[PDB]
Design an enzyme around this catalytic site. Sequence first.
Site, PDB file in Angstrom:
ATOM      1  N   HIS A   1      41.080  37.621  38.745  1.00 38.98           N
ATOM      2  CA  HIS A   1      41.776  38.338  37.678  1.00 38.98           C
ATOM      3  C   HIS A   1      42.928  39.196  38.196  1.00 38.98           C
ATOM      4  O   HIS A   1      43.616  39.830  37.386  1.00 38.98           O
ATOM      5  CB  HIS A   1      40.789  39.161  36.828  1.00 38.98           C
ATOM      6  CG  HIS A   1      40.277  40.418  37.470  1.00 38.98           C
ATOM      7  ND1 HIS A   1      38.967  40.563  37.878  1.00 38.98           N
ATOM      8  CD2 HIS A   1      40.875  41.612  37.702  1.00 38.98           C
ATOM      9  CE1 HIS A   1      38.790  41.778  38.370  1.00 38.98           C
ATOM     10  NE2 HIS A   1      39.933  42.436  38.275  1.00 38.98           N
TER      11      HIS A   1
ATOM     12  N   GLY B   1      40.321  50.470  40.868  1.00 41.72           N
ATOM     13  CA  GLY B   1      40.870  50.053  42.138  1.00 41.72           C
ATOM     14  C   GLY B   1      39.857  49.480  43.102  1.00 41.72           C
ATOM     15  O   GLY B   1      40.249  48.974  44.159  1.00 41.72           O
TER      16      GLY B   1
ATOM     17  N   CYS C   1      37.717  46.953  42.582  1.00 45.57           N
ATOM     18  CA  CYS C   1      37.394  45.545  42.385  1.00 45.57           C
ATOM     19  C   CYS C   1      37.871  44.760  43.622  1.00 45.57           C
ATOM     20  O   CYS C   1      38.897  45.077  44.209  1.00 45.57           O
ATOM     21  CB  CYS C   1      37.996  45.050  41.049  1.00 45.57           C
ATOM     22  SG  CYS C   1      36.973  45.824  39.733  1.00 45.57           S
TER      23      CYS C   1
END
Lengths: 302, 302
Positions: free
Chosen positions: B41, B143, B145
């Site tokens: 993503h 932040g 991920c």
Amino acid sequence: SGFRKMAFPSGKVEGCMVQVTCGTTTLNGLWLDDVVYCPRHVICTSEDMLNPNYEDLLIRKSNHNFLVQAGNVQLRVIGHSMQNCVLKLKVDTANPKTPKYKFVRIQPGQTFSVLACYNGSPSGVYQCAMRPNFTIKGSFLNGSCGSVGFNIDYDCVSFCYMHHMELPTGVHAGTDLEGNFYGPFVDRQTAQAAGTDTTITVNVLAWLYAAVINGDRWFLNRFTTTLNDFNLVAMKYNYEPLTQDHVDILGPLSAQTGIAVLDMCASLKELLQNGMNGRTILGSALLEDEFTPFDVVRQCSG
Amino acid sequence: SGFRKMAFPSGKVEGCMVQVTCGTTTLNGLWLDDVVYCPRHVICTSEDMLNPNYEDLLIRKSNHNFLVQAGNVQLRVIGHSMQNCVLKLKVDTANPKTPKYKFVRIQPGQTFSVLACYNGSPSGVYQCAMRPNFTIKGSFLNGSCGSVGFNIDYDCVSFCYMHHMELPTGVHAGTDLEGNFYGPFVDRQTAQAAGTDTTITVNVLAWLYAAVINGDRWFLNRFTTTLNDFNLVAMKYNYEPLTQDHVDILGPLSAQTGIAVLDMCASLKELLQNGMNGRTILGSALLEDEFTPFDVVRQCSG
Ligand SMILES: N#Cc1ccccc1C[C@@H](N)C(=O)N[C@H](Cc1ccc(Cl)cc1Cl)C(=O)N[C@H](CC(=O)NCCCc1cccnc1)Cc1ccc(F)cc1
Ligand SMILES: N#Cc1ccccc1C[C@@H](N)C(=O)N[C@H](Cc1ccc(Cl)cc1Cl)C(=O)N[C@H](CC(=O)NCCCc1cccnc1)Cc1ccc(F)cc1
Ligand SMILES: [Cl-]
Ligand SMILES: [Cl-]
Ligand SMILES: [Cl-]
Ligand SMILES: [Cl-]
Ligand code: NA
Ligand code: NA
């Protein structure tokens, strides 16, 4: 979201861990530049341990008596000395993995990360607080002595603890990296008792603010208290007195949540007097005191 | 002595953490040999996130659209692909700090260490269990991920988790390193609910054995129970059924302490039915289920 007991990344300290051997006694050492730091009781035999005279034992040592292993390469010792309860071994090779570092002596109530090591090899990392009675409630087995505790600030490693012994009660005692014990302890194999411990009040309050930041609010109330009346309850429950400096340190967290420190103290007072009645705070059924205000700010959202 | 939530030393994973940027979207990636792994993503805009077609978005990407930074050196991307929910970026430089490693997909109830990272830089390490409902109760901010979860066995890093999103409930969901989600979740910005969670019974029992090994015995009793009658109480308290395989896995701990598994189950039954009545176990006022039998053996004395 979420709140966990969180250690510093341990890589920079892992690159410094070595093994120091004197006869049949082996423990962990810390290799920074061309010096290896380790507990001086590595020069004791099992007999010497009851009441050693370390000046005597050290003057009888030769450099070639010390076997220092980094991984599987032996480091040749070219000089040795004693600074309080730490032995310093000069080696002919500077550690190429030496991080930027400082030695710091911390106050009770401060936290640090422990890299538990056996035979110079790291096995695990965990978070500790220095208890008010200068012990730490560690997780240590035989062979772990020489493991270090540390904080990290912007790629600088601040070493603050070296592990020296487990007390008969199963808690742990050691020194700063210049060999000064925390607390009244000495490095001999005798039964030593720690002072009575107390709960770190400023840390409990920090952790209540962590809970609010994370959405736990059930313990809040509309009341407030004065510092003096709070400390009356604190003393009754074996909590450290809360100082004005503690209040000021909790300023940032208070401002972020909108909850005055003395407002939060009224919650703690009510929690001490009535318990939690089956509820939990941040997954805990007791009041947690091993998170400093700094730890909470570091881990929680802005 | 002592028992702590203990993570693996994180150094080997720290040397693999990088930053991946696509336009205004930046997250963490994992650099092993000449491949960078990160959540797919990263190729989504804030608009694309409601319902992306990733095959569409990826075919519209160029290699030069991906900004990969290791420390402060930019890594040039020479190829990209998609494997389930992970993006794979081929870079022209193999990571010189690549450890020996494996990718493994774990079962619920297993634990791992999380290296929480922001902008490719490690900030902290903590221990997690995969919940029975395939979430983890992490500590993650915006932040994070792309941060990974891992175990270490004799200098081999077994990566088992990559972080993809926080659910509306504040718990966390992600994939194995081949991009397959744990649980039924999908990588789009919609409100997804996890299944109802349950307590990991075999782990609670492991932790009771840890307590015995460490000298906590107040919860033991002279009684025993059958597996069936235990599971009747387990179901009533939202505990996972205990299987014969769980019993056999607890064999080593049972043998070390001399306490039959079904003897310990009678203690757990009594603890569930009556609570602790103010007492604690290994410093906890509730029953802890994020230590596997392996975790206990690894940390406790022989
Ligand atoms: N960590 C660690 C560690 C743990 C186990 C074995 C070994 C080590 C490392 C190792 N290096 C080291 O600490 N050994 C010192 C001896 C020692 C070496 C050197 C120096 Cl300078 C000083 C000392 Cl005291 C050590 O054996 N302590 C024991 C450890 C022990 O039996 N705990 C049982 C507690 C059981 C318990 C649990 C819960 C509640 N209640 C009781 C306690 C003790 C006993 C008699 C003494 F007279 C002094 C100390
Ligand atoms: N870790 C983490 C993290 C945490 C905060 C901000 C950012 C991140 C990383 C970041 N990368 C990321 O997870 N962002 C996703 C959005 C997202 C991006 C990408 C993909 Cl593929 C999927 C999703 Cl869902 C995200 O914002 N989730 C929020 C996080 C949130 O508001 N929690 C509040 C919980 C409050 C709470 C606390 C206790 C009890 N009760 C409630 C929840 C949500 C809301 C609407 C949705 F419709 C879907 C998800
Ligand atoms: Cl010599
Ligand atoms: Cl001294
Ligand atoms: Cl291209
Ligand atoms: Cl898919
Ligand atoms: Na930890
Ligand atoms: Na941990």
